[PDB]
Design an enzyme around this catalytic site. Structure first.
Site, PDB file in Angstrom:
ATOM      1  CG  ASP A 193      -8.982 -11.785  -0.070  1.00  0.00           C
ATOM      2  OD1 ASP A 193      -8.760 -12.924  -0.539  1.00  0.00           O
ATOM      3  OD2 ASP A 193      -8.169 -11.198   0.674  1.00  0.00           O
TER       4      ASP A 193
ATOM      5  N   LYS B 259     -14.248 -26.514   1.908  1.00  0.00           N
ATOM      6  CA  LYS B 259     -14.482 -26.618   0.470  1.00  0.00           C
ATOM      7  C   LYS B 259     -14.601 -25.218  -0.142  1.00  0.00           C
TER       8      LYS B 259
ATOM      9  CE  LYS C 184      -9.282 -10.976   4.719  1.00  0.00           C
ATOM     10  NZ  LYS C 184      -9.621 -12.421   4.876  1.00  0.00           N
TER      11      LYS C 184
ATOM     12  N   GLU D 221      -4.757 -14.019   0.830  1.00  0.00           N
ATOM     13  CA  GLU D 221      -4.009 -12.768   0.741  1.00  0.00           C
ATOM     14  C   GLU D 221      -4.466 -11.772   1.801  1.00  0.00           C
TER      15      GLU D 221
ATOM     16  NE  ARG E  81      -2.903 -16.416   5.605  1.00  0.00           N
ATOM     17  CZ  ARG E  81      -3.072 -17.710   5.855  1.00  0.00           C
ATOM     18  NH1 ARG E  81      -2.051 -18.442   6.277  1.00  0.00           N
ATOM     19  NH2 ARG E  81      -4.262 -18.271   5.684  1.00  0.00           N
TER      20      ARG E  81
ATOM     21  CG  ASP F 167     -15.364  -9.357   2.299  1.00  0.00           C
ATOM     22  OD1 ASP F 167     -15.196  -9.517   1.071  1.00  0.00           O
ATOM     23  OD2 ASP F 167     -16.193  -8.552   2.771  1.00  0.00           O
TER      24      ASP F 167
END
Ligand code: MN
Ligand code: MN
Ligand code: MN
Ligand code: MN
Ligand code: MN
Ligand code: NA
Ligand code: NA
Lengths: 516, 514, 515, 50
Positions: free
Chosen positions: B290, B297, B285, B366, B368, B308
């Protein structure tokens, strides 16, 4: 208390002390010989896998006909399908007998029970919606031979024995809406029917104790219930209560329960079998009233989880009773950590002196359930007439348990690999499934760092093995006397479902003890 | 688009493609033969356990003296203690030579690496604060666990990526990084050149994850991938932009269609000489801007958003190490690259490459979705069908709650492949722990009125790491019936000092035992 | 726009334009004479009240036997009870025929439909779960004679015609899980079967439009669907699109939709009947994509409600279609306020509405009422006629659920007569409504603005939230208009746990019938 | 408010002809369109990175 409350609480104590299961057990041949083919009532149930339902053995059953054959074809996986059979002889004399077919899936992962008792519970629950009269017995024909997990599953299903509906409060909260269930196995059960009744009874007593609201099941009434069984079954009970806990150094359980109307109680039950015990085990259970909290979930979520906060105490208590009734070859202690966390700012930043001698900084008053388990654990491993080989603590502890292992698998935090595998096996064999949580004290210890005390009562960072850290806290209060396997079971979620308490815990312990 | 911006990106692409490690490896005997007692600089580090430090072989080391002995007696567990050695011979010509002793703990659980490389890194990082002229520093490690120590030292100290003190002009290459020579007690079981390759991949991964999203974009990542393909000589396939839509990749397309730079499904292919021991497919990924979920939270996910690229960076650098070491494994590496930018796409029903439809009930989750397309691609669209599919991603905040900051969560369908990867984690130091595998209970959480499935579990507190992993498994090809290993590394990819370079070394050790 | 998406959208447009209902209607005597005791398939449903199920006529039905009589005795109020009948004649060739009895309650309050079609839908939905093959016809024997609410109720039930499951995306999102339904009334229906088919089609078309995701039902595709029906049914269409909205003064709808990929559109549809119209009525519908918000609920709640924010435009559109198909004597306009909204952007903007009044945008989430302002002015100022009644329908506020609940649409209306009429339409059609407070004196001060004529959102949320949203819309009514204005907030009644309900059209149809 | 205050203060200095050499820099930009540009490292005109 007022006279009306005292009378109610006494009646409720009696209903728990004298509770008997609605479930009985037998097999097809014995049923055939004893009941002569006559169905118990106008409702019968047939539960099995797609394969099992098509076995020729099914065709020889008393209720079978072409209509039942079609039901087996039309039923969906994990669903039910009901058909009427006219002129089928039954004890109630009903002109029709409703037969409900339930298909159990064979799909089961390496962490689940192969017999899938979760679906068996759902199927029988759905089928009992079509019960006509309240005084009837429903024959539940199961095509599986996994007697223990099915015994628990059927005990678990349907209407709960605890109820306040339709005037049941006048009858000691004994539900009048529960049907008697007769489980019919294919072969004579490997575990005797009377033993299976004992397992079923403990599942349902546990359910009653967790379903019961906190104005009925209090620290005092739970204690009286424990004392009631001790007299009836003939086992020893010891109670350290109120100011005696403070005097004797039990600062954790004392601090948590000192604000209540009823005093906090450390109740310890002792069972020692005839002959040489196979293992010496100590059980510790969290039974704190009005006590549920943490940082992982929202405050509103913990108020939903507070509903089942006696799950740990109930599990160990009922598991204990089964050991005594089945006369299992295990020397057993059961310590109930009972307190009412009455009256957020109060007791915040308090430093308490635990029975272990270690000091705890209360950085969060919502997380005062692992504190009572700390005193319970030390007491079990230090203050008893024997030193246990294994310590099993059970509690509805963290919301992280749900995020980690889910609604069906209790979290296991355990020091020894062998003990973990054993308990995991007991879960898969019993249907009360478990899954391991990270064991790594090197990384858990720093989360409890305190400027002025030996430790805090809550991890600094919530996103660092939430279930594991709560388990670690408890292990720090183990006695140096103890050298064996500690099994911490977080059962915050598996203790309940949408219908209420599940009675999760006791059957897991029973299966664990059978293989020791 | 502008000339100044375009030139900056090109300079950064070159820095990642031409990255060389600052770490070299040797042993005490070879060290004495080549350097003959003269230390490389005015700083030396001695790292080992309480027992190891008191070994008789320690007092026969070049830098040892009464002061160093006092350090060994005064140092705390997991702490450091510094002493000066006046008139000690060194190439830097320093009057004194600072010797910093670090004590490593021996205590390690059954889920942790026995060598405790986590503390090794921490000790060496603290010792490098007393560096004079940022010169080669000799690090004497008393452990022989070469692979985890190699990774441990590679990730310690100042990071190679930096934008401090005018470093932006020099392609964001740090000048504060000191060279390091790790000296093992005996000759290492893995060649020094191989250990250097592992250290490089750890630091390149660190560089990629440290890099901000305006430098490491979907375009620059692919250029860096194309650079290594040209250099090391491996194949590279890129399905870019609207070609993803026409060829059915609706998941990765929908996620990145709003961005200025288009979404790219970048598949690398490496096949060794002769018969490979196993056929393994990697899927990562790499979505820019993203990060999201329901367990934590919104403010927490913004902090996790910084790392990411961890999933894509881990599989990419692990692929590179396999090529550089020439490991006997047929390997593919699909990088699911996209920029989620610009309520938008909420309740959309996208047709995935697998043919199954996904209802987007939450646009924040998004990551996954692109992994679903990457997984089907690897298991259906390649020239070979893999035995093992490994997907790696900074997927869920639930991972931290479940397995913690140091252990990546493992969601895997076969017990054997799980035990293998867990062994790889303990051997390499990049540790993992298993998360519940139970598809019977995960499936109902993704139930949808109109589509085959939703992209997010209904209830948050029902095995969050497991469910996110289950979603990805539904998009596996029917052709595939082998082992699938989902690795959720949301937290282990970083610490307080930045990226950790977690992933590559775990894969390498996994490949070595196949 | 890639070719793959263009083909997908065009296929979806055709599926909506060429949609045909799965339901047909008949009665007992006609059913007997045409099928001769041979059931349509291996499933049949009997739905009635406790008393109706015990009527002598029930024994004479083709599927009746002692097993069915027992099902009538054992079934629970609001529940179902299924029984097999072996060897019963049926066209599907099933060895057994499944008869599912369902009991409808008689309890109904003064604000609810006496037929309780809400339960009827649930009962038939439950009964259809036991269907073996989807390509069959299920006989549904209703013991009630309230043909309109039952028609809408049965059209509502079961599997939805929209689906993306199991390869349905390759067939223009048409579901292959839907069974054909033959509703069999006791008496011949007061409303012709073909007219009931038209009512059912609109309910299900409305359901499809609201169920459809925003990547399929866009501002362009809805417009294309409206154009398609105009060509087929022969009614006029006018489309004010994009920058033309700005130039022609429609600053409200333009500002809301200007940022999107697909441009905002003010689609108006005109239908004039032959002869003298009994009334002139203008419909206005909110159809904003990715647009749902407010202050009464949490942000997470509005994201769930956002899935059904086409419900207003879908309701009026399909209500218009039924009027055209049934040839109801009502001169009808239908203005679809279509735009795509895709938090800080446009915050504190002052837009010049088509009415000439200025609106301060204090909250960018609540711009559904802004597009309705332009639509309401257009209907009352820009058309070839002047309407007697203006009906606007929108999934507007979360306060609606708090006020009137999940089953009753909130009515904000200036005249008591038009209110009572619409309330009666709800109780008769089954698509129930309830009045919200009308009191402009107390609603006006909540929209006080420093520099504009008004704000777009009330200052205090706890001062009649449903009413104030309605009041905002009335301020942009043309001064030419002096008739009755009916504002219908249907935020919640447009959906349930299974998806869209197709709420709206049947209410309008029944409203027109009594004008 | 900031750009307006500085701008209008300048105009008053020009109209009153105040004896102060004055420069007025208006930092004008439209911030469109939360995740976008998060964790970006930018090179400021000063040379320092943010
Ligand atoms: Mn459940
Ligand atoms: Mn449940
Ligand atoms: Mn850390
Ligand atoms: Mn840290
Ligand atoms: Mn409902
Ligand atoms: Na009877
Ligand atoms: Na092959």
């Amino acid at each position: 208390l007022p006279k009306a409350e005292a009378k109610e609480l006494s009646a409720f104590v009696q209903s728990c002390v004298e509770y008997k299961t609605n479930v009985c057990f037998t097999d097809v041949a014995a049923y055939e010989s004893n009941q002569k083919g006559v169905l118990s009532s106008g409702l019968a149930v047939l539960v099995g896998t797609h394969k099992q339902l098509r076995d020729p053995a099914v065709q020889r059953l008393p209720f079978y006909n072409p209509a039942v054959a079609e039901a087996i074809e039309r039923v969906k996986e994990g669903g039910t399908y009901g058909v009427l059979v006219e002129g089928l002889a039954n004890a109630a004399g009903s002109k029709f007998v409703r037969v409900v077919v339930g298909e159990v899936p064979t799909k089961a992962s390496r962490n689940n029970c192969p017999a899938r008792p979760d679906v068996v519970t759902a199927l029988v629950t759905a089928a009992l919606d079509e019960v006509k009269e309240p005084n009837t017995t429903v024959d539940v024909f199961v095509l599986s031979n996994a007697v223990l997990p099915i015994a628990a599953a059927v005990a678990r299903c349907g209407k709960h024995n605890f109820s306040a509906k339709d005037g049941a409060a006048a009858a000691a909260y004994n539900s009048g809406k529960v049907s008697r269930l007769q489980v019919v196995f294919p072969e004579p059960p490997a575990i005797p029917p009377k033993d299976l009744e004992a397992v079923a009874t403990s599942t349902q007593l546990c359910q009653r104790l967790v379903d019961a609201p906190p104005n009925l099941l209090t620290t005092a009434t739970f204690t009286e219930i424990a004392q009631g069984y001790a007299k009836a079954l003939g086992f020893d009970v010891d109670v350290i209560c109120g100011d005696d806990l403070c005097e004797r150094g039990y600062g954790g359980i004392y601090s948590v329960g000192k604000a209540a109307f009823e005093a906090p109680r450390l109740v310890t039950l002792l069972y020692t079998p005839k002959g040489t015990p196979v293992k010496k085990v100590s059980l510790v259970g969290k039974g704190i009233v009005y006590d549920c909290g943490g940082l992982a979930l929202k405050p509103a979520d913990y108020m939903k989880l507070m509903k089942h906060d006696m799950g740990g105490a109930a599990a160990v208590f009922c598991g204990f009773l089964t050991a005594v009734r089945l006369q299992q070859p295990v020397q057993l202690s059961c310590t109930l950590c009972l307190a009412e966390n009455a009256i957020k700012s109060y007791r915040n930043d308090d430093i308490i002196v635990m029975k272990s001698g270690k000091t705890v900084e209360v950085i969060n008053t919502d997380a005062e359930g692992r504190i009572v388990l700390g005193d319970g654990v030390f007491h079990a491993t230090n203050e008893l007439s024997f030193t246990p080989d294994v310590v099993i603590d059970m509690a509805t502890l963290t919301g992280a348990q749900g995020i980690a292992t889910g609604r069906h698998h209790a979290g296991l935090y355990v020091n020894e690999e062998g003990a973990e595998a054993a308990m995991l096996r007991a879960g898969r064999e019993s249907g009360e499934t478990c899954f391991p949580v990270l064991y790594c004290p090197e990384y858990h210890e720093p989360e409890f760092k305190s400027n002025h005390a030996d430790m805090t009562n809550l991890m600094e960072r919530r996103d660092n093995a939430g279930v594991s850290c709560a388990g670690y806290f408890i292990t720090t209060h183990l006695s140096p006397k103890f050298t064996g396997a500690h099994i911490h079971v977080d059962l915050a979620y598996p203790v309940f479902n949408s219908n209420g308490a599940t009675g999760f815990g006791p059957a897991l312990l029973t299966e664990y003890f059978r293989k020791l």
